[PDB]
């Protein structure tokens, strides 16, 4: 009746699957955040992401394309 | 070479090490160690360093000779002092720029 | 690191990352240098503190210094 | 690897900027191949504090900002294997 | 539907003129030619676009790894 | 029962704790004997109890207040007395004779005691050594003492509180002769720290009964159809260790010697010209170290003294709870302003037969030497007033079989051997402070 | 080498977590991994004003991870 | 009485459960060449499941002492029973001063 | 001087096969029940 | 190691511990691990600025301690030698 436990690596492999935005944030920018499709990470989940877009506070989006996050600033990954 | 695999053993490690070199981005130190070309740092604390580089290590630990180190800070007023000889540890490295000697 | 293990029992003062300063006997390091300080006094910019047995991490030290020596034939024809 | 060149050169004179903005000017004692550095008779120079000598004192590592060298050391011998 | 890993999607890309943004604001924008295991890059004719204005030119740079934030274009 | 290992269960700590004491010439040490005649026969004929500090799994010491009793039918007493001022029993049955008569009675009092039990299955090594059984004969040779255990159990109270098994961390197995008593978690935290980051607990409650490790997949089967898999338990644990004793046996120097230093367990030359049975204790004693697991196992699944309190005072107490010296049991104070409430249930033999050492557990108060206590009888009551004795005590000793720790005082929860209060005292007594409430009660 | 965390009693409950600078994540915890990267579902973010914003599910990074909280009785 | 046995227990939690490293000693077998003679030795008598001794004096070895330590053999004449006995009295004797 | 021997497992093997006449075939003790030393001095003591 | 060996021998006591922000917590410590991730009982956080809350399980991870006060009578808890294999500070009794 319980449900199984998900490990975050199978969880971030799911959502390149699904091909789910994402919302990432970031280590110390609190009011940086980036969003996108996901496309790729390895061991370190250096995330390659697709249609980077660099939202800010007020909303001020920002066109950056597919671009590759360092893993050692990710602090968190949305699912839409 | 083709072993970017990352899981080597002692011999193979080493022989991209020295391919991490020999056509990696640090390159650029052999070819200023021997051209002796003009190398300026950044470092992590708004610090401007100018010096010959002799030798380097993986880490981007380096040694320096003859460095002109800058800084910067009343009003903003620049200024200048040049020391001898230098070991700096690759840590606090932001980046390197070459001016060539010739 | 044999240097390190002769400092066992000598009275020592570490500086921290943060800036504050441990005073107090060394009991046990680490291989990360994890400091066991016995009867240790804190120097908080100079305020005392009583803290007692403290476990410092590796991370927070910065320097350490050393300010005291350690507590200290049969017969013929 | 070039760590080795630290252990190499021994009890010379040199003057040490830590990580904090910290100046120690003193001879060195024994440093280490994971840069541990052991100091004696050294003058400890807080950032905006007023200087202070102590008779011994170590470095871990990662403090370590760069060294201030002297001029009385064979630099091109040392630095071989 | 074909994902890129790191290291094939940056390799695939060697040569190109990319915008390597730092930690601390800083864009420096150039070509790069060779790259190791670590994802520290260098470029060439590179030059800083600091505030997203273009003050100076530096030539070539090698950017150690832990400095940047993402790169792209 | 008689001869089945427990006092080579308390050598095997007094060897770690205590480097001086070295091994006999032709015997074993029998640590917590010490009488002549005990000796003599070679078995233990009274319960010494001995206080020594071991460390957990983890690194953590505890301070383990042990009482070795005697495996003869006859020597009962030694049995039922000690263990009424105890949290737990733990049981040791040889995996060759199996459960036998003495066994099945202290498992019976033990349950109908509401007493916790600890397995271990001692001389594990004579399944190897001498019945040469196959790895997966032994496997079934130990479940079957296990399943008799449990049925032993299962005969005074159904309950699934008093259950044993390895996958709950209650049963060691253990060979005191060779020195090593290891359990499931203990000998899954061996491989986890060579072999990487996977939990311990997982990894461990996957090792018993026919759950089947498949060696290519790397999964852990539930039939394992046809042959395509091995028990797991045989697989990880019951192989290697038949294999090391080979090993060692079998005069395979280089082998031997490659394989410890894969694991870092370095020997001098001359050590591998042994006589066989010391390069056993010695190769067991460098891979298996301080007997980890049976500490562990003891300290999760043996109450506290504080945490034991209620039902200590439950059972053996009769006097009621709501009362203030009821209340002082229930939490264990060791305040001074706190009543000194004591059970004595034994009296041991100085070293000269002129005195006689009372045996307690103090429920409750501090107590000091010097101090006046008044000493209850077996039926002390309110129609019997006249069972009360006025004493001093006159020396506080904490035991430890072969010598004694002199204490000027003593707090609650501990096991304390009391001088100068023995001669009012005929079996049992208890033992209370003079400047107390009224109504005093006896256990 | 590494070691797994012990986090097995807190799977599927109620959970708070503390990530650096000053934030603040609900959720019920649902998966872990060696360097304590966690996984929360159906959660929810609070803001220093203090109103509560529905976040969805959350993959965070084991880094940055202060403390991990639950309130149960 | 168990509702669900503690072995589906265990599987049926994560049963995709992975452990990468091999147990010990693999490469090896249970029984090498010289196992079963090291066996017989080992609960051999006294001489004889050592390795590694004190090279006792020629005459310091009885070779026959345990004929008499033992009981004496069945329908044997009636001097050599006495022999028996006798050589045990002997040997009583020199152990008991 | 000859002083101390080590053998290896073969050699013991080998002798303990040679010199299988000469030596007990019990291992186990508990076959002197009332017939080893203490019996016997317990016997001269009680004259029985 | 010593120091985690120390770190664990504390565990069912109270041990007051600061993070990387600057806040105190004093509550029973009830596990630890060579991470020195910790798990605690009915904290008292005191924040930088002095504000005094209150927890009741927390899960602190280990990479974000400055120091630890452990309670003064485990000053007596023994230092055991280490060999080269050994991962856990435990008396010995073979070669090393
Ligand atoms: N082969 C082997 N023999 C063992 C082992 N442990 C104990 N023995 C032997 O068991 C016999 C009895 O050991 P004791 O420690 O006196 O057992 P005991 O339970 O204390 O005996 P009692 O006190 O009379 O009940 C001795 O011959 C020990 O050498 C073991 O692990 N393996
Ligand atoms: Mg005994």
């Known amino acids: 009746v319980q449900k199984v436990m998900i490990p975050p690596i199978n969880f971030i492999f799911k959502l390149l699957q699904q091909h789910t935005p994402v919302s990432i944030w970031l280590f110390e920018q609190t009011d940086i955040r980036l969003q996108g499709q996901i496309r790729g990470f390895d061991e370190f989940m250096n995330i390659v992401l697709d249609d980077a877009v660099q939202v800010d506070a007020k909303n001020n989006k920002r066109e950056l394309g597919r671009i590759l996050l360092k893993g050692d600033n990710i602090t968190l990954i949305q699912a839409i | 070479v083709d072993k970017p695999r990352s899981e080597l053993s002692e011999i193979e490690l080493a022989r991209l090490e020295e391919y991490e070199f020999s056509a990696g981005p640090l390159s650029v130190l052999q070819q200023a160690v021997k051209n002796h070309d003009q190398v300026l740092i950044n470092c992590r604390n708004n610090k401007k360093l100018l010096a010959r580089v002799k030798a380097f290590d993986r880490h981007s630990n380096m040694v320096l000779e003859n460095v002109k180190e800058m800084w910067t800070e009343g009003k903003a007023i620049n200024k200048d002092r040049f020391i001898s000889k230098m070991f700096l540890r690759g840590d606090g490295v932001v980046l390197v720029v070459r001016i060539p000697s010739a | 690191t044999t240097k390190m293990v002769s400092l066992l029992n000598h009275s020592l003062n570490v500086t921290t990352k943060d800036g504050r300063t441990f005073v107090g006997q060394l009991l046990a390091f680490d291989g990360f240098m994890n400091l066991v300080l016995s009867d240790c006094q804190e120097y908080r910019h100079e305020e005392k503190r009583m803290l007692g047995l403290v476990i410092l991490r590796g991370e927070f030290i910065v320097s350490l210094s050393v300010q005291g020596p350690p507590p200290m034939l049969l017969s013929g024809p | 690897k070039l760590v080795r060149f630290l252990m190499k050169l021994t009890n010379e004179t040199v003057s040490i900027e830590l990580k904090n903005g910290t100046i120690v000017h003193g001879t060195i004692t024994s440093v280490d191949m994971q840069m541990n550095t052991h100091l004696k008779a050294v003058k400890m120079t807080v950032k905006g504090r007023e200087p202070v000598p102590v008779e011994t004192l170590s470095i871990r590592g990662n403090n370590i900002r760069y060294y201030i060298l002297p001029d009385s050391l064979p630099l091109d011998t040392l630095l071989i294997d | ?73 | 029962h008689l001869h089945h290992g427990k006092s080579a269960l308390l050598d095997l700590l007094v060897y770690y704790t205590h480097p001086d004491t070295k091994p006999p010439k032709r015997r074993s040490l029998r640590y917590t004997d010490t009488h002549y005649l005990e000796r003599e026969r070679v078995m233990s004929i009274k319960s010494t109890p001995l206080t020594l500090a071991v460390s957990d799994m983890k690194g953590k010491t505890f301070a383990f207040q042990c009482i070795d009793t005697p495996g003869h039918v006859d020597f009962v007493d030694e049995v039922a007395a000690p263990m009424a001022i105890s949290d737990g029993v733990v049981l040791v049955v040889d995996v060759i004779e199996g459960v036998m008569i003495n066994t099945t009675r202290i498992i019976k009092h033990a349950i109908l005691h509401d007493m916790p039990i600890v397995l271990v299955l001692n001389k594990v090594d004579r399944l190897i050594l001498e019945l040469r059984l196959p790895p997966n004969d032994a496997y079934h040779k130990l479940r079957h003492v296990i399943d008799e255990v449990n049925d032993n159990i299962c005969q005074i109270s159904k309950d699934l509180k008093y259950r044993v098994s390895p996958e709950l961390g209650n049963v060691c197995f253990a060979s005191c002769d060779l020195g090593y008593c290891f359990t499931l978690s203990s000998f899954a935290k061996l491989y986890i720290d060579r072999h990487g980051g996977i939990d311990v607990d997982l990894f461990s409650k996957r090792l018993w009964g026919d759950i089947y490790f498949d060696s290519k997949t790397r999964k852990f089967a539930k039939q394992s159809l046809d042959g395509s898999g091995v028990r797991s338990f045989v697989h990880f644990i019951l192989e290697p260790l038949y294999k090391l004793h080979t090993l060692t046996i079998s005069d395979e120097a280089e082998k031997l010697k490659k394989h410890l230093s894969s694991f870092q367990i370095y020997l001098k030359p001359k050590d591998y010209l042994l006589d066989p049975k010391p390069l056993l204790q010695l190769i067991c004693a460098s891979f298996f170290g301080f007997p980890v697991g049976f500490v562990n196992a003891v300290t999760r699944h043996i109450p506290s003294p504080r945490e034991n309190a209620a039902r200590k005072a439950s059972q053996s107490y009769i006097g009621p709870i709501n009362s203030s010296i009821g209340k002082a049991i229930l939490e264990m104070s060791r305040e001074e302003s706190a009543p000194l409430v004591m059970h004595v249930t034994k009296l041991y033999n100085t070293v000269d037969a002129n005195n006689f050492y009372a045996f307690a557990r103090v429920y409750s108060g501090q107590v000091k030497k010097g101090q006046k206590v008044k000493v209850l009888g077996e039926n002390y009551s309110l129609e019997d007033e006249e069972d009360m004795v006025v004493a001093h005590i006159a020396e506080i000793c904490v035991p430890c079989a072969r010598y004694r720790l002199h204490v000027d005082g003593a707090v609650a929860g501990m096991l304390v051997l009391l001088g100068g209060v023995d001669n009012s005292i005929s079996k049992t007594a208890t033992i209370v402070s003079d400047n107390l409430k009224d109504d005093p009660y006896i256990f | 080498k590494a070691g797994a965390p012990d986090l097995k009693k807190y799977l599927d409950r109620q959970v708070f977590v503390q990530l650096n600078g000053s934030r603040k994540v609900y959720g019920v915890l649902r998966g872990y991994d060696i360097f304590l990267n966690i996984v929360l579902e159906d959660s929810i973010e609070e803001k220093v004003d203090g109103e509560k914003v529905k976040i969805g599910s959350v993959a965070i990074r084991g880094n940055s991870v202060i403390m991990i909280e639950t309130l149960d009785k | 009485e168990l509702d669900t046995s503690p072995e589906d227990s265990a599987i049926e939690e994560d049963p995709n459960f992975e452990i990468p490293f091999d147990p010990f000693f693999h490469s090896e077998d249970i029984e090498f060449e010289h196992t079963a003679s090291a066996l017989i030795l080992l609960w051999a008598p006294h001489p004889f499941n050592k390795r590694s001794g004190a090279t006792k004096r020629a005459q310091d070895v009885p070779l026959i002492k345990h004929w008499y330590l033992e009981h004496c053999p069945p329908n044997q004449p009636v001097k050599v029973r006495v022999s028996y006995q006798k050589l045990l009295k002997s040997h009583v004797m020199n152990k008991l001063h | 001087t000859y002083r101390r021997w080590k053998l290896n497992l073969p050699q013991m093997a080998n002798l303990h096969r040679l010199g299988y006449q000469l030596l007990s075939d019990l291992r186990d003790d508990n076959y002197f029940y009332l017939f080893n030393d203490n019996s016997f001095f317990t016997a001269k003591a009680l004259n029985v | 190691s010593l120091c985690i060996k120390l770190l664990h021998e504390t565990q069912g006591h109270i041990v007051t511990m600061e993070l990387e922000n600057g806040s105190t917590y004093r509550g029973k410590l009830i596990e630890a691990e060579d991470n020195m991730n910790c798990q605690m009982r009915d904290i008292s956080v005191t924040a930088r600025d002095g504000r005094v809350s209150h927890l009741d399980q927390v899960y602190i991870r280990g990479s974000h301690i400055r120091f630890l006060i452990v309670p003064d009578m485990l000053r007596n808890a023994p230092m055991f030698k280490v060999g080269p294999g050994r991962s856990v500070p435990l008396p010995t009794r073979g070669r090393r």
């Open chain 5, 1 to 73: 539907f074909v994902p890129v890993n790191p290291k094939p999607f940056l390799q695939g890309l060697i040569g190109k003129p990319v915008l390597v943004r730092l930690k601390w604001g800083q864009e420096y924008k150039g070509t790069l030619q060779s790259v190791d295991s670590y994802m520290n890059l260098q470029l060439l004719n590179a030059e800083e676009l600091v505030d997203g204005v273009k003050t100076g030119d530096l030539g070539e740079i090698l950017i150690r790894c832990n400095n940047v934030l993402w790169v792209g274009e």
